[PDB]
Amino acid sequence: TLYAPGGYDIMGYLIQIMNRPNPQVELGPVDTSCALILCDLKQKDTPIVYASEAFLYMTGYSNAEVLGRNCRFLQSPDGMVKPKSTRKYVDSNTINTMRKAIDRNAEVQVEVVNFKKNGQRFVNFLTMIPVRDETGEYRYSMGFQCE
Numbered sequence: 001t002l003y004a005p006g007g008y009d010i011m012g013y014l015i016q017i018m019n020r021p022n023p024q025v026e027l028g029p030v031d032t033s034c035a036l037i038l039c040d041l042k043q044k045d046t047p048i049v050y051a052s053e054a055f056l057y058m059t060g061y062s063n064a065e066v067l068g069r070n071c072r073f074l075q076s077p078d079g080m081v082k083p084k085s086t087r088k089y090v091d092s093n094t095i096n097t098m099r100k101a102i103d104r105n106a107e108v109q110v111e112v113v114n115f116k117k118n119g120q121r122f123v124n125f126l127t128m129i130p131v132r133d134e135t136g137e138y139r140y141s142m143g144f145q146c147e
């Protein structure tokens with residue numbers, strides 16, 4: 001996984017999201033003080049390319065343990081979840097809903113059981129919205145996590 005050398009336009013993307021003409025889920029106002037991440041949809045397995053301070057702190061994982069990985073790792077108390085595996089602590093329907101929404105560039109909002117680095121179980125009120133890069137086409141996905 002590689003990252004944009006100059007960094008990501010997180011604030012620009014936040015504004016883009018709040019300005020979206022056809023919102024499908026209720027986000028309301030959000031900013032960089034929250035736990036959020038940006039994944040690259042044009043790279044293998046939609047890797048995380050940006051994680052806010054709040055996300056790292058809320059989950060207990062460091063930047064080096066988050067960047068370049070699919071966020072599904074939060075689905076196991078040991079931070080290890082293989083793609084297509086049948087999770088034993090997370091509802092399959094919820095996981096499937098997330099997968100199809102991403103594949104369709106459709107907004108989605110769910111409550112999913114996740115685990116912190118120390119293994120603590122928590123419910124993640126998660127919202128994901130597709131983001132267009134400078135080309136005007138969808139390239140990234142911004143996720144908003146809330147314990």
Ligand SMILES: Cc1cc2nc3c(=O)[nH]c(=O)nc-3n(C[C@H](O)[C@H](O)[C@H](O)COP(=O)(O)OP(=O)(O)OC[C@H]3O[C@@H](n4cnc5c(N)ncnc54)[C@H](O)[C@@H]3O)c2cc1C
Binds near residue numbers: 072084087112
């Ligand atoms: C920006 C962003 C932020 C994210 N943040 C989080 C986060 O904070 N926490 C989190 O947990 N995830 C998060 N995700 C989601 C995660 O990265 C994956 O997208 C999610 O787990 C679903 O995709 P998958 O690849 O894991 O699917 P898969 O590994 O393919 O798993 C799908 C599961 O659903 C079941 N299933 C599939 N199809 C069907 C069907 N037709 N009928 C019945 N069952 C079916 C299967 O049994 C399977 O185990 C985020 C994603 C993005 C893009």
